[PDB]
Design a protein around this motif. Structure first.
Motif: not given
Ligand code: CLA
Ligand code: CLA
Ligand code: CLA
Ligand code: CLA
Ligand code: CLA
Ligand code: CLA
Ligand SMILES: CCCCCCCCCCCCCCCCCC(=O)OC[C@H](CO[C@@H]1O[C@H](CO)[C@H](O)[C@H](O)[C@H]1O)OC(=O)CCCCCCCCCCCCCCCCC
Ligand SMILES: CCCCCCCCCCCCCCCCCC(=O)O[C@@H](COC(=O)CCCCCCCCCCCCCCC)COP(=O)(O)OC[C@H](O)CO
Ligand SMILES: CC1=C[C@H](O)CC(C)(C)[C@H]1/C=C/C(C)=C/C=C/C(C)=C/C=C/C=C(C)/C=C/C=C(C)/C=C/C1=C(C)C[C@H](O)CC1(C)C
Ligand SMILES: CC1=C(/C=C/C(C)=C/C=C/C(C)=C/C=C/C=C(C)/C=C/C=C(C)/C=C/C2=C(C)CCCC2(C)C)C(C)(C)CCC1
Ligand SMILES: CC1=C(/C=C/C(C)=C/C=C/C(C)=C/C=C/C=C(C)/C=C/C=C(C)/C=C/C2=C(C)CCCC2(C)C)C(C)(C)CCC1
Ligand code: SF4
Ligand code: SF4
Lengths: 733, 82, 193, 97, 81, 42, 153
Positions: D60-85
């Motif tokens: 239902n997002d105006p641009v079409g952001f769906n759950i799979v993109d959320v999972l992928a970009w959250g994976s990127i964010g978690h990986i970057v955060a754990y690398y930083i930590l």
């Protein structure tokens, strides 16, 4: 068909005996069978893969069970040195009493064989300590074999038969295999090392009972989820640590410190846990690349289409190559075998220099057997890769779908490739043989100082670039002021430099002019075998002598005596010729390895450094000198435990010489002999009552080439294995 | 012609076995040295009776043992033979 | 023409700003490839133009040089300095995060435009002084930009090569070394040690 | 550092970049890249398990952001955060120069 | 269940392929695609042994007669017993 | 005489003469400059 | 001292090898009277050995730990005479031979029966083309520049 073989109507109605032969060597070639489709071929391949997995699991279970039942693993654990491993017991009714005397080794009560496969060290390192563990592992592997057989039966039934397009779903298969078969399996092995093997090395018995009660770390999973991962690398095992006991132990789990364990002379288990964890991370990341039912990901077809260099220097680039590589099973088989052979050579070259199991560096015979085994395996697998590439070119290659591709342009300029390979092989052979003959002549004339000894300056500089300081080069990883040295100074450099600079292990052995000459001979062998295999693959579809070779299949005898003679014109014959060169190359490699290591282990590297520069030194100081105890396995004065190796030595010599008649003598003489033999049997009283059902004929030309090659390879392998094991077991070092 | 080509190898094999037999038998049972007392010591010490009955005996006591004089000829006047 | 007495390549006709007919490898045969090369060259030259004072001025003011200013991130827990004053939030994770956040979305809008002229010369808010209104002066300024930018690219190659030859020092230090006694210390000493 | 703050910041920045900055380029690339065999897609070639989940990717997002993109970009964010930590915890690694 | 002998249109009309056959497989039939007004034919490939004497005498750039080895019988294996 | 010179121009006779001259030159060089492992003239 | 190799003129093992060679030669020499031809031959061999060892020491060769000279082909200017200078000389001679053969094959290419000029070499043309390989690098470079070295088929 109405007669064996039932997969070939043409072979079934054969009145001769070759049918019985030809139903054996065509049984697993499904593409040549009768009334086959694509999906049936794929399902047969799937079922045979399940079967092969079942036999692999059953063989491993048998190894574990025989070690548990007849070996001395429990007594070997307490004393890893001064105890010989036992593979299995010997029960031979033909044995004499002195054979029972000489073969009673270890703490066994009867004749036993000494295990040279290294399974003892591997099982001791990864946490197995008692015979009940081996029994449980054998039971689990038998259960896995039964499960794989059940799955192979299930996936052939009409309800569970997969579609052909399911097998061609390359993206999902690659994603799942990279993430699950590679990443998840490596993560599970990391878990096994962390939970069981590493505590087992420190004297803690962790099994399925205390599995959920023993913490791998004092701080648990807290340092895993709240950052600060370095708490898993606080106190590693000390330099005075004793393997299997708590003396000098630590509590670290994942460390990056180079070098070997001081006692076991092998890599740290924590290093291996961290390595497999990082590899699991990398493969799990790489397993999310390709597109699947979730929308995101890459399409490998468009990946191949897009990579076209402008200007047309590669033609149409990789256009349409996805369809050919996906539709052809032989393309995938050739790539798989090429990669498997490369990493098998990697396994061989990395286990001897960086040993992975406790107390395997001291076991010299095990290391020699493992290296020779895996190198011969890699050579055979690479030969098969090239052969299956030739098979793809004959069978599955589509010129209309591959026009101006990077694959058709190989056939476009095949003459340049073959001629340049020929030039490289000829130059290497000419100059290496000339230098060797020059050295032999100079030392024959009493002047060893007139030899041409070229120092391998490049490889010595590389060794200095890896940290060796025996050549005086002040370069990266050997100079204390370099940025490469300064960046990794605190992490792993002290242990790595200590292991490299120690002149007792196999890590970066000191090399000389003999190493240069034997490495150039190795390059000659590789280039020549590549020349034969590439020529066969690229002339498989045809040449100027036989423009329609593709119509005659992969394996056919000849094209008659016309056009000057056309013997050995098929690509199968190119494979058959290249097997000899592969065997010669691996023989050179293993000769070099065994002689260098058998001179290093004795502390007499000067013998190799002074005798490997000429061929008479190889013949005398290696083959003649080290075979005394082998040929003295049995004599008129008695026998000892090396008699089996002498018998296998002579057996290999005999079966190596027997293939010479399938390779030299050819078919017509034997057919004309068999005609007279058939006449004699038909006219002999009391023997005309017995008559054959299949008419006796001579061996087929391709069949006889295969039989001679098989006898040749069996002789090669058995002879060198007997010599190697007898030389390294009559003296261990 | 191919029958002649095949029989060449077998003639080679037969004559090679014959000359090996002659060499070992005369080295072990005929050739040698005479001492002043009267005893006779042969070149190979009369090992043909007990060793030549096995292929391992031919490999060790005849090929391996007597090839030491041709592989160690380097640096001397017999190096052309090596 | 870049090389007198040499024929011009067929891809170039001299109509472009700075079109001196130099393409020995023939990289710009395809017209859209040549347009992409024009855009990429303009971006490279503009970045080097922003680079050259950004390297010379901090060295002239006694704040170190363009290689000292990156030493702090090498040190553990390093603190960045501006005008001799330490920025409180100037740490490597924060600096890298804000650089990735703001350097993206400003390189993303640049890729949204499809007009090639607007991809090279956008105008609008980026031309507030109205220097592109007159066409003849617009082409003259295009040529001036191209020439000064190629000079800046050559200057940056000089920066990198002089830093490799003389590790850990500034370009103005090299200029002073040349001005001390030019007949003895120059490229010749490193070209023949 | 504080794991919660770093993880939340990295995941938020990665999701922001995926939703706003690198959304059109990614959508165009998935439009251009579709896995096909023998000139036809995997599902229509006869594979019943290769059908794309249009219900899971409908948003239902105006641009079409769906759950799979959320999972992928959250994976990127978690990986970057754990690398930083994990890097900030270690007071070592290419530091001596 | 016989060797496959095939004749192509590049056949000149020389009867050497027929004269070189030891089992009477080939024969000469009328044609109109060459000067000799004849072409070879293989009606009795069941007696073909595969000796390839026929294509050892074909004078074209490549062979107008081609023998592809195939399923073998007692008369295709040259067995007198 | 023309036929004899043609025979002297055939492959084995000419090869024998050429290779004999080359072998003699190499042997004389090895006598006058023996035991050459490097090129020390420069 | 490249790659941990002592120079042959400052190597104890090199002198040791010379000592063993001279001792063996003297042991062979002791069997004959000094005025005989075998004695003169042995003495000449000993003098040749001494000259060889002195030349190897003075040439700048690096001797290994076994007392034998080791050639360095990495391109070091101290040892350009071991590989690079003889390599250049060999390349010059091989290019001479190849260029002369190629010129002879090109010259007899457009004849009625060219093969008759291969089994029976036409000596005057061959001797005319023999010295054309003296300037083989210049001729080969120009032929490559004019596109005459290669054939486009
Ligand atoms: C990774 C596994 C692997 C697999 C699955 C295949 C698969 C196949 N190969 Mg390849 N191959 C491999 C590795 C592999 N190969 C290797 C390592 C080599 C080099 C030794 C070869 C060399 C090779 C040849 C030379 C040929 C094939 C062909 C074939 C077919 C098997 C023929 C048969 O019926 O059995 C035959 C074998 C036996 C049942 C017994 C006879 C010989 C045994 C091994 C004696 C030695 C002891 C099958 C398509 C055949 C085909 O016709 O392709 C078109 C064929 O001509 N392969
Ligand atoms: C994540 C789940 C998953 C898993 C676990 C597997 C796993 C497997 N599949 Mg795949 N597959 C999947 C998804 C998955 N698949 C999907 C979704 C599809 C459909 C698109 C397929 C389609 C498919 C087909 C069509 C086939 C397979 C095959 C196989 C088997 C390969 C043979 C083998 O055992 O490799 C063993 C290899 C490893 C464990 C790792 C690689 C080894 C590396 C190269 C070596 C380095 C490792 C290390 C040094 C080892 C040390 C050794 C030790 C002694 C010290 C394996 C069981 C074959 C089959 O099923 O055979 C029965 C086959 O024919 N798969
Ligand atoms: C051990 C003996 C042996 C030797 C020396 C060779 C040699 C060679 N093989 Mg053969 N081969 C052998 C056994 C051997 N093969 C076996 C058992 C098989 C299995 C059937 C094959 C199958 C085979 C294949 C399939 C191929 C070769 C090819 C080659 C060439 C490889 C390149 C190179 O090394 O050239 C260096 C040259 C030499 C070592 C040989 C010459 C020896 C010296 C230099 C002679 C100089 C002459 C001297 C002055 C004597 C004068 C003669 C007379 C006047 C007395 C080379 C001619 C490959 C090829 O053709 O490459 C171009 C290739 O395609 N071989
Ligand atoms: C092209 C982009 C550019 C970039 C990336 C930099 C980058 C840098 N500048 Mg430079 N600078 C530039 C252009 C640039 N400059 C220009 C155009 C001028 C002239 C006004 C200057 C004049 C200055 C000053 C810096 C300093 C710095 C550093 C600290 C930044 C900060 O915010 O604190 C940083 C490495 C500091 C420095 O010298 O480092 C120690 C300082 O105080 N710069
Ligand atoms: C792989 C190739 C090879 C190479 C590179 C060499 C290299 C060498 N050999 Mg060895 N050799 C080889 C194979 C090889 N050999 C083989 C196969 C054999 C056994 C047949 C020998 C047996 C051998 C002997 C018996 C001797 C050598 C010697 C030599 C040396 C040069 C001889 C000389 O004095 O030239 C001098 C220079 C020239 C002839 C150049 C001629 C150029 C003409 C005049 C043109 C001038 C241009 C205008 C040199 C180290 C000699 C030695 O003393 O070694 C230390 C020597 O006595 N070699
Ligand atoms: C006339 C001179 C001649 C020339 C210029 C060439 C040129 C070439 N050869 Mg050919 N070749 C020749 C003669 C010649 N060849 C002969 C006589 C043979 C039979 C042994 C071959 C067999 C041959 C092979 C097997 C190979 C080449 C290859 C090559 C190429 C690489 C160079 C090399 O590998 O040399 C190697 C050269 C030989 C093996 C030694 C023979 C050459 C002798 C020493 C000289 C012949 C000169 C002639 C008799 C003198 C007559 C003089 C005239 C006045 C009458 C190169 C295009 C290689 C290739 O194709 O890769 C591109 C390669 O694989 N050649
Ligand atoms: C004794 C050794 C000499 C043997 C050669 C002399 C007799 C051979 C025949 C002969 O000379 O016929 C005489 C022949 C040719 O002499 C005449 O020539 C005529 C051409 O105008 C015709 O061919 C005549 O038939 C032919 O007889 O002369 C030669 O060709 C001989 C060439 C020199 C031979 C050198 C001998 C040295 C090498 C010997 C090997
Ligand atoms: C080392 C790098 C070598 C690069 C070679 C690739 C360049 C193209 C090769 C083309 C060639 O061989 O021929 C050219 C000539 O060769 C060269 O220009 C290359 C010379 C290479 C040697 C010099 C390289 C530098 C060496 C520095 C030391 C041009 O001839 P053409 O095709 O115009 O001839 C046509 C003819 O007249 C008929 O119409
Ligand atoms: C567009 C627009 C728009 C709107 O509308 C308006 C406006 C705003 C106005 C506009 C803008 C503008 C601008 C911004 C500009 C800028 C410029 C620059 C910066 C340049 C540089 C420029 C730059 C340059 C040339 C450079 C040069 C350089 C050089 C020579 C160098 C030298 C040197 C030296 C001495 C020394 C050392 O040892 C070496 C070297 C280093 C080599
Ligand atoms: C016949 C044919 C075929 C096959 C083929 C083959 C069999 C091949 C092989 C191949 C091979 C077998 C290859 C190999 C390769 C290798 C490589 C490519 C390597 C690389 C390496 C690298 C890259 C490295 C790097 C580095 C170094 C130097 C060290 C340090 C580190 C690093 C990593 C950086 C096919 C089927 C395809 C198709 C058809 C045809
Ligand atoms: C509703 C909405 C909203 C909100 C949203 C949100 C808030 C979201 C979130 C999201 C998220 C929050 C996501 C996440 C994701 C994540 C994931 C998906 C995962 C990741 C991870 C991974 C994949 C892994 C990891 C790991 C581990 C396991 C351990 C080791 C290390 C590592 C890191 C590797 C708003 C208001 C705006 C608007 C309206 C609508
Ligand atoms: S098949 Fe051969 S022999 Fe018969 S007509 Fe044709 S070319 Fe002549
Ligand atoms: S192969 Fe022999 S039998 Fe068969 S058609 Fe040809 S010549 Fe006749």
């Amino acid at each position: 068909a109405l007669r064996f073989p039932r997969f070939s109507q043409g072979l079934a109605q054969d009145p001769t005996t070759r049918r019985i032969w030809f139903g054996i060597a065509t049984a697993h070639d499904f593409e040549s069978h009768d009334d086959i489709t694509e999906e049936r071929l794929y399902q047969n391949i799937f079922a045979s893969h399940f079967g092969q997995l079942a036999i692999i699991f059953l063989w491993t279970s048998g190894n574990l069970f025989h070690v548990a039942w007849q070996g001395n693993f429990e007594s070997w654990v307490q004393d890893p040195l001064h105890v010989r491993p036992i593979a299995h017991a010997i029960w031979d009714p033909h044995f004499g009493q002195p054979a029972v005397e000489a073969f009673t080794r270890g703490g066994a009560l009867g004749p036993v064989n000494i295990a040279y496969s290294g399974v003892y060290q591997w099982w001791y390192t990864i946490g197995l300590r008692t015979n009940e563990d081996l029994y449980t592992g054998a039971l689990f592997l038998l259960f896995l074999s039964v499960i794989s057989l059940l799955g192979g039966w299930l996936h052939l039934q009409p309800k569970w038969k997969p579609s052909v397009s399911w097998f061609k779903n390359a993206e999902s298969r690659l994603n799942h295999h990279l993430s699950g078969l590679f990443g998840v399996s490596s993560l599970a092995w990391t878990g096994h090392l962390v939970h069981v093997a590493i505590p087992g090395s420190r004297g803690e018995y962790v099994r399925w009972n205390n599995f959920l009660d023993v913490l791998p770390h004092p701080q648990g999973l807290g340092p895993l989820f709240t950052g600060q991962w370095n708490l898993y690398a606080q106190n590693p095992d000390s330099s005075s640590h004793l393997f299997g006991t708590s003396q000098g132990a630590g509590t670290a789990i994942l460390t990056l410190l180079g070098g070997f364990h001081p006692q076991t002379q092998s890599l740290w288990l924590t290093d291996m846990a961290h390595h497999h964890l990082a590899i699991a991370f990398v493969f799990l990341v790489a397993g999310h690349m390709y597109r699947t039912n979730f929308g995101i990901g890459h399409s490998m077809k468009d990946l191949l289409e897009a990579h076209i260099p402008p200007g047309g220097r590669l033609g149409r680039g990789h256009k349409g190559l996805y369809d050919t590589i996906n539709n052809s099973l032989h393309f995938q088989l050739g790539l798989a075998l090429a990669s498997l052979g490369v990493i098998t050579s990697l396994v061989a070259q990395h286990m001897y220099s960086l040993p992975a199991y406790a107390f395997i560096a001291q076991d010299f015979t095990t290391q020699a057997a493992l290296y020779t085994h895996h190198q011969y395996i890699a050579g055979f697998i690479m030969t098969g890769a090239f052969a299956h590439g030739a098979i793809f070119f004959i069978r599955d290659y589509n010129p209309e779908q591959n026009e101006d591709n990077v694959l058709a342009r190989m056939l476009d300029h095949k003459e340049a490739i073959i001629s340049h390979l020929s030039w490289a092989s000829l130059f290497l052979g000419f100059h290496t043989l000339g230098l060797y003959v020059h050295n032999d002549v100079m030392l024959a004339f009493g002047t060893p100082e007139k030899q041409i000894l070229i120092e391998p300056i490049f490889a010595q500089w590389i060794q200095s670039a890896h940290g060796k300081t025996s050549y005086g080069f002040d370069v990266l990883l050997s100079s204390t002021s370099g940025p490469a040295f300064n960046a990794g100074r605190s992490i792993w450099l002290p242990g790595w430099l200590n292991a490299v600079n120690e002149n007792s292990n196999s890590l970066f052995l000191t090399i000389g002019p003999g190493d240069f000459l034997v490495h150039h001979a190795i390059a000659l062998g590789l280039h020549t075998t590549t020349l034969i295999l590439v020529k066969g693959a690229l002339d498989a579809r045809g040449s100027k002598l036989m423009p329609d070779k593709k119509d005659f299949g992969y394996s056919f005898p000849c094209d008659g005596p016309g056009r000057g003679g056309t013997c050995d014109i098929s690509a199968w014959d190119a494979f058959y010729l290249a097997v000899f060169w592969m065997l010669n190359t691996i023989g050179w490699v293993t000769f070099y390895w065994h002689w260098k290591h058998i001179t290093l282990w004795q502390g007499n590297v000067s013998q190799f450094n002074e005798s490997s520069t000429y061929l008479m030194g190889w013949l005398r100081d290696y083959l003649w000198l080290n075979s005394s105890q082998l040929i003295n396995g049995y004599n008129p004065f008695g026998m000892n435990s090396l008699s089996v190796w002498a018998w296998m030595f002579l057996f290999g010599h005999l079966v190596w010489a027997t293939g010479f008649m399938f390779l030299i003598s050819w078919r017509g003489y034997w057919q004309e002999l068999i005609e007279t033999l058939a006449w004699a049997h038909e006219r002999t009283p009391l023997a005309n009552l017995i008559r054959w059902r299949d008419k006796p004929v001579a061996l087929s030309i391709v069949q006889a080439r295969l039989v001679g090659l098989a006898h040749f390879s069996v002789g090669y392998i058995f002879t060198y294995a007997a010599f190697l094991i007898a030389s390294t077991s009559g003296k261990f070092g | 012609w191919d029958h002649v080509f095949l029989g060449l190898f077998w003639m080679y094999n037969s004559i090679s076995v014959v000359i090996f037999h002659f060499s070992w038998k005369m080295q072990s049972d005929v050739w040698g040295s005479i001492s002043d007392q009267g005893v006779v010591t042969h070149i190979t010490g009369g090992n043909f009776a007990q060793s030549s009955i096995t292929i391992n005996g031919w490999l060790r006591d005849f090929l391996w043992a007597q090839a030491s004089q041709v592989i160690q000829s380097y640096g001397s006047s017999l190096s052309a033979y090596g | 023409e870049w090389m007198p007495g040499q024929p011009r390549p067929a891809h170039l006709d001299g109509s472009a700003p700075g079109d001196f007919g130099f393409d020995p490898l023939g990289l710009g045969e395809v017209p859209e490839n040549l347009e992409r090369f024009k855009e990429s060259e303009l971006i490279h030259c503009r970045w080097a133009m922003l680079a050259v004072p950004g390297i010379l001025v901090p060295e002239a003011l006694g704040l170190g040089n363009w290689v000292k200013a990156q030493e702090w991130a090498a040190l553990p827990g390093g603190q960045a300095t501006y005008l001799g004053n330490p920025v409180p939030w100037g740490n490597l994770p924060t600096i890298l995060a804000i650089e990735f956040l703001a350097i993206a979305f400003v390189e993303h809008q640049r890729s949204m435009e499809k007009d090639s002229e607007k991809k090279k010369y956008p105008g609008g808010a980026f031309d507030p002084l109205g220097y592109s209104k007159d066409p003849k002066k617009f082409e003259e300024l295009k040529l001036k930009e191209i020439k000064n930018g190629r000079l800046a690219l050559l200057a940056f190659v000089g920066f990198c090569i002089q830093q490799s030859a003389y590790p850990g020092t500034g370009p103005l230090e090299n200029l002073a070394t040349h001005l001390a006694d030019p007949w003895h210390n120059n490229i010749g000493d490193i070209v023949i040690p | 550092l504080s794991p919660s703050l770093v993880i939340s910041l990295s995941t938020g920045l990665s999701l922001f970049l995926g939703r706003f900055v690198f959304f059109n380029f990614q959508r165009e690339n998935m439009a251009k890249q579709v896995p096909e065999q023998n000139g036809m897609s995997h599902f229509e070639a006869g594979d019943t398990r290769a059908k794309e989940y249009v219900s899971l990717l409908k948003s239902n997002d105006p641009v079409g952001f769906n759950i799979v993109d959320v999972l992928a970009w959250g994976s990127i964010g978690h990986i970057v955060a754990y690398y930083i930590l994990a890097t900030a915890s270690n007071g070592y690694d290419p530091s001596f120069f | 269940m016989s060797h496959s002998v095939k004749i192509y249109d590049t056949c000149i009309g020389c009867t050497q392929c027929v004269r070189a056959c030891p089992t009477d497989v080939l024969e000469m039939i009328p044609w109109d695609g060459c000067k000799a007004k004849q072409i070879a034919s293989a009606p009795r490939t069941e007696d073909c042994v595969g000796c390839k004497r026929c294509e050892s005498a074909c004078p074209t750039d490549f062979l107008s007669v081609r023998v592809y080895l195939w399923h073998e019988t007692t008369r295709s294996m040259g067995l007198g017993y | 005489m023309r036929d004899f010179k043609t025979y002297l121009s055939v492959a084995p006779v000419l090869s024998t003469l050429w290779f004999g001259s080359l072998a003699g030159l190499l042997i004389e060089i090895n006598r006058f400059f023996p035991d050459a492992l490097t090129f020390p003239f420069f | 001292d490249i790659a941990g190799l002592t120079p042959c003129k400052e190597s104890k093992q090199f002198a040791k090898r010379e000592k063993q060679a001279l001792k063996k030669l003297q042991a062979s020499l002791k069997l004959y009277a000094d005025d005989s031809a075998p004695a003169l031959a042995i003495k000449a061999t000993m003098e040749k050995t001494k000259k060889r060892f002195d030349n190897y020491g003075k040439y700048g060769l690096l001797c290994g730990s076994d007392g034998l000279p080791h050639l360095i082909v990495s391109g070091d200017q101290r040892h350009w005479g071991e590989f690079i200078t003889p390599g250049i000389l060999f390349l010059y001679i091989a290019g001479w031979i190849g260029w002369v053969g190629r010129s002879y094959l090109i010259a007899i290419r457009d004849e009625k029966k060219p093969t008759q000029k291969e089994i029976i070499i036409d000596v005057p043309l061959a001797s005319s083309l023999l010295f054309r390989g003296f300037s083989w690098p210049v001729a080969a470079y120009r032929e490559l520049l004019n596109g005459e070295l290669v054939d486009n088929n």
